[PDB]
Design a protein around this ligand. Sequence first.
Ligand SMILES: [K+]
Ligand SMILES: [Mg+2]
Ligand SMILES: [Mg+2]
Lengths: 21, 49, 56, 95, 92, 68, 144, 354, 49
Amino acid sequence: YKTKPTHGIGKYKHLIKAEEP
Amino acid sequence: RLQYLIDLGRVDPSQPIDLTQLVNGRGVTIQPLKRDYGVQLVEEGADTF
Amino acid sequence: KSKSKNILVRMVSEAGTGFCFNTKRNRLREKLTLLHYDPVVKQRVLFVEKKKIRSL
Amino acid sequence: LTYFSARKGKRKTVKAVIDRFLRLHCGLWVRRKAGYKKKLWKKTPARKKRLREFVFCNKTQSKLLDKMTTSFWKRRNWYVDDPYQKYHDRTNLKV
Amino acid sequence: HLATAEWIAEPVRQKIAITHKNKINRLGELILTSESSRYQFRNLADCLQKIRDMITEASQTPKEPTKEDVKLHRIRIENMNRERLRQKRIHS
Amino acid sequence: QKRREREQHIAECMAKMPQMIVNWQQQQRENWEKAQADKERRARLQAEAQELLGYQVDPRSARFQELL
Amino acid sequence: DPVENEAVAPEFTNRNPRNLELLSVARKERGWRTVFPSREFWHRLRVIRTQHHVEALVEHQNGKVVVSASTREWAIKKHLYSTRNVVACESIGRVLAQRCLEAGINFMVYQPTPWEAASDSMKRLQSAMTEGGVVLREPQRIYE
Amino acid sequence: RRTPPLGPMPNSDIDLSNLERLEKYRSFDRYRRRAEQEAQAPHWWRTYREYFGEKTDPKEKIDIGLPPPKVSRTQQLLERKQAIQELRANVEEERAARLRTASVPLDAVRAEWERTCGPYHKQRLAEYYGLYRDLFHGATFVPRVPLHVAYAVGEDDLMPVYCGNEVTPTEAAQAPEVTYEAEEGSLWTLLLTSLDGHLLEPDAEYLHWLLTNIPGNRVAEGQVTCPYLPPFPARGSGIHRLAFLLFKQDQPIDFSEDARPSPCYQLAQRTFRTFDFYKKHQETMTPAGLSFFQCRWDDSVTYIFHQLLDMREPVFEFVRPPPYHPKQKRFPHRQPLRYLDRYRDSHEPTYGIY
Amino acid sequence: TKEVYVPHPRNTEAVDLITRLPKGAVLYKTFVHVVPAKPEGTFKLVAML
RNA sequence: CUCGGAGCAGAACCCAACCUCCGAGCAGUACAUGCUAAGACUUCACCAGUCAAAGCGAACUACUAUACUCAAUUGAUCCAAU
Ligand SMILES: [K+]
Ligand SMILES: [Mg+2]
Ligand SMILES: [Mg+2]
């Protein structure tokens, strides 16, 4: 949740190369 | 209900009991105009009858 | 509305129970014969298409 | 609704109601589901089972149906082998 | 008292004791109980029918292979492995 | 009589059912086996083209179907 | 004149951790349907293959290891030409099956990946377990 | 509004500038291995382990057992490496391994396992079964003296007791044959307790067997402090744990306060707690060996209750909580007709005043 | 709670993602659990035969 | 002019304009898409709609197998056909 310190623990797309045709 | 009526003297077990005696004792109310065809004897109270 | 591809057909049990179920099939394919559960006999039996109910 | 008939000066029943709803003596009304015989080929088994259920009406609908039917339809009946006999009386109902 | 009862055949008495050993108490009395009805009459009738079923089953001597219950299936595997651990004496 | 006739009809029809199934299933396998054979043929017709792709890729297959 | 031995508590307390499991009434951890592997089991066979060794574990769903067999053990290593081949995996299955029976473990689930299941190593290890007496499926929980 | 993380966030140590040059997993198996490791580490956020993991005490479990044996690793490693070279030098061994026809001798493996890792596998298995929890209130020991217990069944067959295998009360109707390796002059105490049998007290045990001051491994010459009573797991009560505990005595001990009569058929006298028994004798007694089996009711248990214990047999049943239903409402809108049956006590017709 | 996310090996899309992740990187997701409140049942004395 | 997705409406739910954008009025695979039944959700009413443990019967000890893939993919009552 946004307000909580665990905000963004599930972020993953920054770890993968941008593959956008 | 039948045992209750007999205990209070409202129905006489010494004579045959039919609809006339049940009605005369005010034991049951029958409405022939409302498609009543008579009385059905139900088991409730069998243990103490 | 004009487009037409499939059709709804009645599948009747071959066990003689009279149990039927409806299925969808392509209009240009052959009549269906399916193995389907028949509750009357309580086991899977062959069903054969009899009639087309409507166009889907 | 006809509150006072021209011939008897009595309330009349809306017979459309009698053809669709079952009144249990405890006050509940039972009905079928709209569409339960419609387009079954496009409906899932779970949905079709829901549509086959006999369901109860709410308070407002029950009050309405009660007004649209005369007292005759609220009497206690003793039909022989009535399938709904058990449901005419409530049990363990609080408040 | 199952053993004393002379209205049941002796062979039937001995086969009921094995089949319904779990219903026979320390004194040897076969105890049946029914609580499925509001009326004592129906409860007694159920108990009496159980007695009649017990005598019928014992006399029938059915050899038909009944379908194995799920709880029994697990016990069968567990009994098989218990026999598999059984050993023999080195010097008998 | 009606009940006896319906039960007899089902019994008779249901005694034939086991043989009916083996025939049906055996023929379904053959139908599936006959589709696979047709698939192999198409692939062969493309090899006969020998990568000479273009507009004249559809009619070539038609010529060989006529031969079959 | 009551009998002292007949003083029995109205409720029986069985502290055996396996009691409800052995009666197939204990809860299994259902759920986790979007992740792998499932948690819906009491015991599971888990096989760890490394560059040099093969280890097989029987563990409770709570994460406690019950029994184990590894080629790191001298008892097994001394009889093996290689501790990393198909023979090693089959040997681990046979040794583990015996240890399972002695511990009372007759049932477990095995949760391989598709490539692991197809491998000859795991197929030989599974056959060793079933030949050894262990059943690699668990009985269904009884809810009623 | 934002709140700073309470600790290091996952995936923070990854350098995102050199993403193209960083090594990727490439395999499901390599990700899973790392994922399993991360799951086991402690975290500052809420976790499944926090709510479902057993709450172990932070202080380590006190070891109350015999000292570990002293080993020379250098000499051991030399002998082990030499044996492997000899095995691998043989050309038939290489061919059997390559052709997948080789096998291990299970009997020889177990013998070596008894002398090496066996003790630690038994400790791990006893911990899983809750024996240390129930017998010593969480204190543990490594059973370093292999204890072999077998019940004689018939005349040619034996039923061994390992560590949780099932033995029936009929098989255990008489005292088992017990053997262990003991030096001359050593004294030992063997006891059998039912952890789950007690019919009255939830935290109490039944003492089924107590032999004290055993000279060496001659169990038949020890003092019968409590005579053997076969297991009597009550019908419907599930599966019980019976544990044999072997104790090494430092000196001859006086067990007069633990002596039971012969025969002892009173369940109040058999009431026993291993923790209390060991606590008073801890200064002169050390746990050495352990064996246990699992037992369920069988038809021979009726004989124990009716004849030996002179009592009626208790029968138990597993009873489930009653099903939940929401409070019944006067108008159950849109609920099916069977809604009313959920709140009905009886199935037989009622007629009220009539 | 927050837990490590391991997809099923048959879920092609999710597996394609994790294989392309830098080594050392672990995906997390939010999970909801129910902590059972009551035991499955209790053993009760039913008879003294 | 009915239905669905996105923004407006940034974080539980809800939220309008002849506001800003994109779609739907199917298709495909099954033929147990069989039966039954706790407990719940719900488009702010009703109608309608949605998800389901256990159980029966199947399947099953290779199938992210158990209320099919799919976002919408749709039409009450009467009545008619059978
Ligand atoms: K107990
Ligand atoms: Mg609503
Ligand atoms: Mg189910």
